Design a binder for this molecule. Structure first.
Ligand code: OCA
Length: 178
């Protein structure tokens, strides 16, 4: 029984819903008796808070793959993309050293954050992915934005109704990678 560890934030932990309602739990359901999905995501977690938890998780879960979904809160709070990039790099190193396969998810900020900043934030992902030669999954939120009925009031977080769809899309994206 191989393990996929998910190191992410509210987008993966679920926002204003229980963990059982978030897509990782639904993905774990359809990957029943196949692959184990461990959702180690916490709402509001910056890339540093995530990195802070990683060591213990690798040690305890001995995952074959780690899906990294972090940075969104940093950019959202105007952090220094140079810093975020540095944190994500350590995360990838930790994963590799743990003899696990890192899977990086691309993150993008709202258009109302300025072109300058958004481009610098976004570029981090392709850059690290090239640097470590790891898969760079597209940003699943891009498809969700196209369906207002799948978005919560804040225009940021996907709602309960969106979870099964995100689970299916994620299963599709992760398939070749597992
Ligand atoms: C629009 C960028 C996506 C960032 C969402 C951060 C998720 C959280 O609330 O932990």
């Amino acid at each position: 029984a191989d393990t996929l560890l998910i190191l992410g934030d509210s987008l993966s932990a679920g926002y204003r819903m229980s963990a059982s309602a978030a897509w990782p739990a639904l993905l774990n359901d359809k990957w029943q008796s196949k692959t184990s999905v461990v959702n180690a995501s916490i709402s509001g977690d910056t890339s540093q808070q995530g990195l802070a938890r990683l060591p213990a998780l690798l040690k305890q879960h001995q995952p074959r793959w780690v899906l990294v979904e972090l940075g969104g809160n940093d950019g959202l709070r105007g952090f220094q993309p140079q810093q975020t990039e540095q944190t994500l790099r350590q995360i990838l190193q930790d994963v590799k050293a743990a003899n696990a396969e890192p899977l990086l998810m691309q993150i993008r900020l709202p258009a109302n954050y300025g072109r300058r900043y958004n481009e610098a934030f976004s570029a981090i992902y392709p850059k690290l992915a090239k640097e470590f030669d790891v898969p760079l999954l597209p940003f699943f939120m891009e498809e969700v934005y196209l369906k207002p009925q799948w978005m919560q009031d804040d225009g940021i977080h996907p709602n309960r109704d969106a979870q099964p769809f995100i689970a299916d899309w994620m299963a599709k994206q992760l398939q070749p990678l597992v």
